[PDB]
Structures are given as C-alpha cells and as structure tokens.
Amino acid sequence: RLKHLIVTPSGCGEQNMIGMTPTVIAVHYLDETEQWEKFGLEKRQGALELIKKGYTQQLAFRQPSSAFAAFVKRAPSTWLTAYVVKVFSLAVNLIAIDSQVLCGAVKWLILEKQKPDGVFQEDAPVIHQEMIGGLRNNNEKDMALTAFVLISLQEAKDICEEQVNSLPGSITKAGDFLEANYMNLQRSYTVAIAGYALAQMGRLKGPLLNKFLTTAKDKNRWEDPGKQLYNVEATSYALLALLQLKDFDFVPPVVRWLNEQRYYGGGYGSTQATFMVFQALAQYQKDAPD
Amino acid sequence: EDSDIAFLIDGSGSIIPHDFRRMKEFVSTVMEQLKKSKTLFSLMQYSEEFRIHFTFKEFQNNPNPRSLVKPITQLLGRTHTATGIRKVVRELFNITNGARKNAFKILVVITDGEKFGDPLGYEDVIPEADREGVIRYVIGVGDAFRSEKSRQELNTIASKPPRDHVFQVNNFEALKTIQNQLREK
Ligand SMILES: [Mg+2]
C-alpha cells in the first residue's frame, strides 16, 4: 500500500524537506523491518540518490551559526533549524553526512535560544505552520516547544558530544523545566511529547507518568479534536515514549488502533505524522522479539 | 467433597483479545463439565485495576456459566499479579464472600508471566499463600514459555510440585488433572 511516499523535493525553504521526509522515512521503515524483497532491490540507492539531492539542496541556504531558516538573509527560525536535524537522525542509517555541522548549529541554539530556566521561545516563527503538526493554536506557549527542542537535540545525542560539550546542559535543564512543570498541563499533545523527552532522560517515573498514562482514551489513543494528525502523531510520541520503558502491555492496544486506522503516509500538510507514523512502527519491530 | 476454586486471570494489555476470548471459553468449559461435590467457583479479573466478577454467593445463586461468562470484558492495563493474589485470598477467600469452612482452596492463575507495575512483589504473596493453604495452579498463555523470565515467574506463582501445578492454556488436560487430583481426595 505504501507506494506513495517517495516524493520529489522542491521549494525554497522547506518543501525540499517536505519531500525529503517521505523520501527518508520509507527507507527507514522498509530497511529495519527487512521488507526489501517484493520490489527487486535496485532502487535503494535511488532514494539515497534522491536524498543526496535534497539534503544537499537543503544546504544551499546554510547560516553562519549553521542555523536554518527557510530564508538566509532572514533571522533564522528554530523549528526548521532543529527538525531538519531530526530528519537526519534517520538518514544516518544509509546516507553519509558530516557531523561538525549540527554541533555548530546547537552551539547557537544554546547560546541564543535557551533561557536560564529551560524555556525555549522560538525567536522566529515561520510562514509554514502546516508542516509543524500540532503546534499552531495551542495555548501552552512554550511547553510543547521546550520538549520538541529537547527531542530534536537528544535524537542526535552521542553525536555532538565531542565537538560541543555544552549540549548536555541544554538537555538537562530543559527536561528539568519539564519534570517540575510537566504535571500541570491540560492537553494530551503536550502530555505526549514531554513525556517522551523525560523518557529520553529516563525521568518518566512518577505522577508525571500517571497524567501522561491517564490521558489514554480507551488506553489506545491520546484524544483531542484538533486534527487526527495531532492525535496520530502524539500516539506515535507516546509509543516511542513507551518502548523506552520496555512496556509490553499497553503497546498492542496502540498497535491495534494504529493498525486499523489504515494510514500509510500522504498529503499536503501530512508531514509530521508521516515521519512519526512509521518511525515508531519501525523502532517497534526493532525491540519486539518476533 | 469440600472444594473452593478461585480464578486470578490476567486482564493486562499484554493479553491479546483472542487470549481473552480463549480465557473465557476455557474457564467456562471447566465449569460446565465440573458440577461436582458442590465445587465452588470465584473469579476476579486483574490488571492495573481489579474486578471481582462474582464472589462465591453471587456464584452460588447463579450456576449457569455460559450466561455468566460471555459478557466479561477486558481492562487493558498493566500486570499486577501479586497484588491480585493477596486480594483473592483476603477477599474472595474470605467467608464473608461465600467461602465455606473446611473447603479445599485452589487458585487458577491465568497469566502471561510478566509482572509489571505491581507495587507489590512476588516475595510477599506466596509464603502467605503457603501459610494459608491455597493450592496454586498457573495457566500460562501466549508466548509464556518462549523466553526465560516469563516462564520463571510462572513457577514462582505455582506451588510445588510444578509438574502438577503449572500448566499450559491450550492443554485441556489441567482440568482432568485437578479432576483426578480431587477424584482421589
Ligand atoms: Mg501484561
């Protein structure tokens, strides 16, 4: 069913990535899951070819602190600045990229994009808030951000540890700001993502857990009405947030639902969920003894 | 000819509904063909939370199993087995719930062998089950024998000997095995 995910990257600032994510999440599900037997196997490099065409094009507009906006001369953002960084954590599977570039990016994101208290104010919102998934019209100003930064950073941990020894601080105090101020949230989206980052720091043990655990509607979804992309994405956040405590109880429910929705990636805007949909379906089969 | 049998069934999310389907069709068939010597039955479904579906009285008033068992549904939580153990013997195996003086106490734990999230450990709830004399069979399900800790948690639930106490779910022999184990009692 999944034949509609290798897509042509394009667009000035991020559409290349918009096309790079369905071109990078396929080779990440398909590979780890040993599903390279129906097609014939002559395309695998075609994607890496496709990837070396877009990520490279994504570098046509580097910024001096290795920062990333859609636009160079502009004061650059932080969602595309760190999210293309996270689209690369799946690239390391096959593509050959260098590593000093991200540590030269993070040095700025801690020197000029974190407050003494663990806040992360996106000092440049973007013009494309449809690529961002469920980050548009929530009230919770910078909780969802402070953890979305933390997960982007911690995805490529044990990578920028040599070149930049500042990073572990930004991770810790951001997650501290989370744990002391994670319980007092209302929505499940913010519940889901920040649970996972404390799970990344191993710190998701306690009532902070209960709220996140609680919020499960029928134990197989984090229910909100904003968009299914918000729910399906945060379900894939909690699922990754679940594999990290090695739970094998609450996982099949999710799996069941996540395998009756019959979502296989696709559509304008369907950018965040696409990534998460199969990133978590893939790490699942990596842990689950089959 | 005195006999009180309890059921401590896992209802955690690690139980797939077919396992749960198969639990209900299994626990029933034990009942239907075993109206013997006034054998008394109690069940409780356990998970993160717990549900006494019937005590002995609620059971004594209605003997029709198929009517009893069809509606039972799943809880989809974690696996608090040991905390479900002490609650059975303290609540289901209380006379206040129908337990008869001088009856043989047997508990049939239907679980998948993965204790999880129980604030109580296993070391608390077994030697009390010994000091209080419940015969503890374990009916392990799904993938319970594939790995190591899952089958070992089972022999830690069952009493000794395990060759007469630990059984597989699919085998329809365990009931005949208690049937003959009572038949000679
Ligand atoms: Mg379980």
Taken as a whole, chain A contains a residue count of: 290
Taking an 8 Å cut-off on Cβ atoms, the answer to whether B79 and A247 are in contact is no
- Selected for mutation to probe chain B from A220, A250, A259 (highest B CB count within 10 Å) is A250
Taking an 8 Å cut-off on Cβ atoms, the answer to whether A219 and B76 are in contact is yes
Residue B12 CA, ligand 1 centroid: distance in Å:
5
Residue A165 to residue A238: CA distance in whole angstroms: 29
Q: How many helices and strands (H and E) does chain A possess?
A: 11, 0
Residue B113 CA, ligand 1 centroid: distance in Å:
8
**Residue pairs spanning A and B at CB distance below 8 A:** 31
C-beta of residue A95 within 8 angstroms of C-beta of residue A51: yes
Residue A26 CA, ligand 1 centroid: distance in Å:
31
Taking an 8 Å cut-off on Cβ atoms, the answer to whether A249 and B114 are in contact is yes
Residue B165 to residue B158: CA distance in whole angstroms: 6
Residue A190 to residue A201: CA distance in whole angstroms: 17
Task: State the greatest distance between any 2 C-alpha atoms of chain B, in Å, as a whole number.
Answer: 42
CA quadruple B132, B141, A209, A287: dihedral, nearest 10 = 140
C-beta of residue A25 within 8 angstroms of C-beta of residue A279: yes
Residue A155 to residue A87: CA distance in whole angstroms: 10
Token pair 């894939």 is found at A236
Q: Domain A14-287: give its CATH architecture.
A: Alpha/alpha barrel (1.50)
Residue A203 to residue A227: CA distance in whole angstroms: 29
Closest CB from A218, A252, A289 relative to B14: A252
Residue B166 to residue B185: CA distance in whole angstroms: 19
Touching check for B113 and chain A: CB below 8 Å? Answer: no
Residue A275 to residue A6: CA distance in whole angstroms: 13
Residue A108 to residue A114: CA distance in whole angstroms: 9
Residue A269 to residue A280: CA distance in whole angstroms: 19
C-beta of residue A134 within 8 angstroms of C-beta of residue A229: yes
User: Nearest Cα to A48, choosing from A95, A4, A92?
Assistant: A95
Residue B152 CA, ligand 1 centroid: distance in Å:
15
Beta bridge partners of B168: B140
Question: Chain B residues with CB inside 8 Å of A258's CB?
Answer: none
- For B80, the closest chain A residue by CA position comes to A249
Residue A27 to residue A162: CA distance in whole angstroms: 28
C-beta of residue B53 within 8 angstroms of C-beta of residue B9: no
What 8-state DSSP symbol labels residue B91? Answer: I
Distance from CA of B151 to the nearest CA of A (A): 16
What 8-state DSSP symbol labels residue B183? Answer: H
Sign (positive/negative) of CA torsion A98, A99, A101, A105?
A: positive
Helices (H), chain A: 15-32, 44-57, 79-89, 100-111, 143-155, 167-180, 188-200, 207-214, 228-243, 251-258, 272-287
SS3 category, B57? helix
Closest CB from B14, B77, B146 relative to A248: B14
Whether the ω angle into residue B161 lies within 30 degrees of 0, i.e. cis, is yes
Q: Which residues contact B7 (CB under 8 A, 6 or more apart)?
A: B27, B41, B42, B43, B44, B107, B108, B109, B110
Residue A167 to residue A157: CA distance in whole angstroms: 9
Structure tokens at B176: 């005949």
Question: Chain B residues with CB inside 8 Å of A247's CB?
Answer: 78, 116
User: Nearest Cα to A169, choosing from A153, A186, A188?
Assistant: A153
Distance from CA of B121 to the nearest CA of A (A): 17
What 8-state DSSP symbol labels residue A161? Answer: T
Closest CB from B14, B146, B147 relative to A249: B14
Computed on alpha carbons and rounded to an integer, the radius of gyration of chain B in Å comes to 15
C-beta of residue B160 within 8 angstroms of C-beta of residue B137: no
At B46, the amino acid letter reads: Y
Please give the method by which this entry was determined.
X-ray
Q: Which residues of A touch B (CB under 8 A)?
A: 218-220, 247-253, 289
Q: How far is CA A230 from the centre of its chain?
A: 13
Q: Is A130 exposed, middle or buried (0-12, 13-18, 19+ CB in 10 A)?
A: middle
Residue A243 CA, ligand 1 centroid: distance in Å:
14
C-beta of residue B166 within 8 angstroms of C-beta of residue B145: no
What 8-state DSSP symbol labels residue B122? Answer: G
Q: CA angle, A138 as apex, A137 and A141 as ends, to 5°?
A: 115
User: Nearest Cα to B169, choosing from B112, B89, B103, B97?
Assistant: B112
What is the β-pairing status of strands B166-168 and B50-54? unpaired
Distance from CA of A201 to the nearest CA of B (A): 20
**Edge-to-edge, what's the strand order for the sheet holding B50-54?**
B50-54, B40-46, B4-10, B105-111, B134-140, B166-168
Going from N- to C-terminal start, the domains of chain A cover 14-287
Q: Which residues contact A290 (CB under 8 A, 6 or more apart)?
A: none
Q: CA angle, A229 as apex, A227 and A232 as ends, to 5°?
A: 115
Question: Chain A residues with CB inside 8 Å of B13's CB?
Answer: 219, 249-253
Token pair 């509606």 is found at B71
Distance from CA of B16 to the nearest CA of A (A): 7
Token pair 């993938």 is found at B143
Q: How far is CA B112 from the centre of its chain?
A: 12
Q: How many CB atoms lie within 10 A of CB B132?
A: 12
Q: Which residues contact A273 (CB under 8 A, 6 or more apart)?
A: A133, A229, A232, A233, A236, A263
